[PDB]
Amino acid sequence: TIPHLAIDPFSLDFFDDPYPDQQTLRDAGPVVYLDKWNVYGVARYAEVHAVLNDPTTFCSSRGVGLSDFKKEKPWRPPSLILEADPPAHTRPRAVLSKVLSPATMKTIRDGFAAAADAKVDELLQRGCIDAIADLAEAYPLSVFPDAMGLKQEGREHLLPYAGLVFNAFGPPNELRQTAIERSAPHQAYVNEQCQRPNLAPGGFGACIHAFTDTGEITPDEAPLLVRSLLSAGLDTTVNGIGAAVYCLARFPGELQRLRSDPTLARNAFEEAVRFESPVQTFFRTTTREVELGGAVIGEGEKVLMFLGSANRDPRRWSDPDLYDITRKTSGHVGFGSGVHMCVGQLVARLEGEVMLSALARKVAAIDIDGPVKRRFNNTLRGLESLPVKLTPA
Ligand code: HEM
Ligand SMILES: COc1ccc(C(=O)O)cc1
Ligand SMILES: [Cl-]
């Protein structure tokens, strides 16, 4: 019954061309058994969406990577939000939700939009740019660290620190073991910046620490919640903006549609998150025996969810392999779904929308011109280099 697959969804060969293996994942059955990591997988939209939306049965407090925190020591002290279940999750979730609320976004949106317009104007002076280094990375680096209230020095650690955190969800392969062996200087940098004296007034970090004054969180919790924004808040949006530029470069007809109606910017960014799914996978662990995909899975079992595959599952999406900036994207799982659904999603959408808006208004063509190089990571999907030529409007 439950079919076996030898597919290693954490291997270099899979990252370099995942779609034929994702389709085998889906077609083999609603639940698969991965022999490479002795773990159950669900790759269809129906199972992934159901598991995200039953956190009681499929918990996050035993870890959302392969490692079971009941059985093995976590590689770092657990996140208070990502690796917690309700009710322990609920208070820190409510705190970060207020820190990153629609009201907060309104207060920072003009400066984010101005930085994205200035960036696109500067890139158009050079013409030949790397859409990763000069855009997908440079743009969030120019707005997010400042929005957090970080000091200038040490910011070069932010991307490798996120790369470590996202590799650490994976199985114990070489990407994970190498990242953990090199982790100490990145972790020392982030640990210092999570402290209250180091976070400038008015930014997200100081706003988090302001909740210690009323007692909503303790002095020990506050630096761990700042740590969640420094683990997830930059490299995700780097890879989301990168996906969107890549999609627009490969689908020239969709770029023209966006130029013809720039109000499509926010949806063209949502559709890039669905299409590429920058965060490809998370796990859950069962807290009871449960029927999943017609099979009775025992209590205590890891289940790997393939969010990228759910987002491309033809049982749910029409022409899922096409980038379509007017697709109805509501329901995609690129930001997760339910109680843990991305608490930073308004920040990611803000950055995505204002950058795509600047591109829609200022650029007439995006042509790939030189070797595209993939970056490999156990959880994040994206490119290391995307050289392009931008033609001004
Ligand atoms: C395109 C960009 C992004 C993508 C694709 C993404 C993806 C995800 C996904 C799939 C989850 C669900 C985790 C789960 O169910 O276990 C999540 C949660 C989370 N995200 Fe995002 N994210 C992005 C941007 C951001 C940003 C900008 C921030 C912060 C400023 C952020 C902070 C977090 C945090 C702290 C959680 C844990 C929420 C919880 O457990 O309740 N993310 N995100
Ligand atoms: C979506 O990826 C992450 C990674 C880490 C954290 C965290 O450290 O809380 C949250 C979400
Ligand atoms: Cl850490």
Domain residue limits, the chain: 1-393
CATH 1.10.630.10 assigned to 1-393: yes
SS percent in the chain: helix, strand, coil, step 5: 50, 15, 35
Ligand 1 centroid to residue 298 C-alpha, Å: 28
Tokens of 313: 């599952």
Of ligand 1's listed atoms, the one at least distance from the Cα of 64 is 16
Q: In what order do the strands lie in the sheet with 58-59?
A: 4-5, 32-34, 39-42, 302-306, 281-286, 58-59
Ligand 3 centroid to residue 170 C-alpha, Å: 16
- Residue 332 among known ligand-binding residues: no
- Residue 49 among known ligand-binding residues: no
Distances (CA, A) of 96 to 30, 171, 205, 225: 34, 29, 10, 8
The residues near 275 (Cβ < 8 Å, ≥ 6 apart) are 243, 247, 311, 312, 323
Q: Return the ∠ at Cα 185 (arms to 181 and 189), rounded to 5°.
A: 140
Distance CA(144)–CA(265), nearest Å, equals 20
Phi, psi of 59 (to 5 degrees): -90, 165
Q: What burial class does residue 30 get, using C-beta atoms within 10 Å of its C-beta: 0-12 exposed, 13-18 middle, 19+ buried? A: middle
Distance CA(5)–CA(15), nearest Å, equals 17
Tokens of 293: 């995909």
Distance CA(224)–CA(16), nearest Å, equals 34
Please report the beta strands in 160-205, taking only residues with DSSP state E, as ranges in sequence order. none
The residues near 257 (Cβ < 8 Å, ≥ 6 apart) are 264, 325, 326
Phi, psi of 376 (to 5 degrees): -100, 135
Of ligand 1's listed atoms, the one at least distance from the Cα of 340 is 41
R_g over Cα of the chain: 20
